[PDB]
Each structure stands twice: as C-alpha cells, then as structure tokens.
Amino acid sequence: MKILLIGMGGTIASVKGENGYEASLSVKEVLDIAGIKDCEDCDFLDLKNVDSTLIQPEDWVDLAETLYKNVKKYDGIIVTHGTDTLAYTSSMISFMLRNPPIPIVFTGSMIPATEENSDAPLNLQTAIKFATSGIRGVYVAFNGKVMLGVRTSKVRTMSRDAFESINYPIIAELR
C-alpha cells in the first residue's frame, strides 16, 4: 500500500548535458519518465545523487538511519542506486538492518530512464511489484529478477542483465 522510494543517484536518474557533464533527476521525476502509473500513494525521498563509484561507507550509515526511520511507516521501500556499487550497498545494509519488517528493494538501470530503450521501467515495475509482496528482507531487483541483496553481484558491465544471485536461488522473476 504505502511505498517509499529513496534516490541515491546512478545512471537511472541521469541525463547527460549538452557537453559531457552528467546531470541528475529526482527519484519522483525518474518514475514519471519511466512511466510508472500504478504507483499511487508512493512517497519520494532524495538522499543522494551520485554515481555509485563515489559511494563511501558513511553513505551506508545515512541510508540505514533513513531506512530505520521509515520501516514502521511504510509497507515496502525501494532504493534507486548506481549499479557499480549496488551490491555493496545492498549487502552492507543487510548487516546494519538485520531484521527488516518490510521488503527493502534496491534497483537501478544501465540505460537512463530518459533514454528510449531504458531498462528503468522494467526494473522499477519489478521493484514495486516486489515491494508490495509482504516478503520481509533486503533485496535487489534487476532485469526482471529479484535477488537476496546479500547474494547479489554485478557480473556484466555493458549489459541490461548486469546481476546475478550467486550460490543462491533467485527469489522471484517475471518468467
């Protein structure tokens, strides 16, 4: 029912400017541009707006605190993030927040939502479908697949199917 989306940045929320400088969108704008319409009664917090290569440990603290503040209020949380360090973030968060009462789903995209063939809509559709599932825990949603956050790794640098559940069954996938 009530779903909070937290922005962290990443390609998902990008629109490279007319010279060579990446610029960032708010998470709310990202959803509108992706074209997610079912998502009503959805709140939006913007926490960072960086390329995830820039992610430092302190960011995990900010993010966990934010999350801890919001678990009792929301039924599912989604966090948009750069793919580069997504699995680091997802894993670390999994240790800080040992027993989440709600699904906390990380996602992102390789092609920015603004672009024509972006993987953003699918990833977000996926993330939202699962955020409503009632499945407690920290997850990653990518390329129509949901993975335990603490078993996910980036395996491809230039493909939509960038992630894999390693040594552990995929939790769910649209197949």
């Binding site: 909070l4 939006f44 917090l45």
Partner: peptide, 4 residues
Amino acid sequence: LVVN
C-alpha cells in the same frame, strides 16, 4: 523530507 518527502514528496507525496
């Protein structure tokens, strides 16, 4: 701070 949240947008609805």
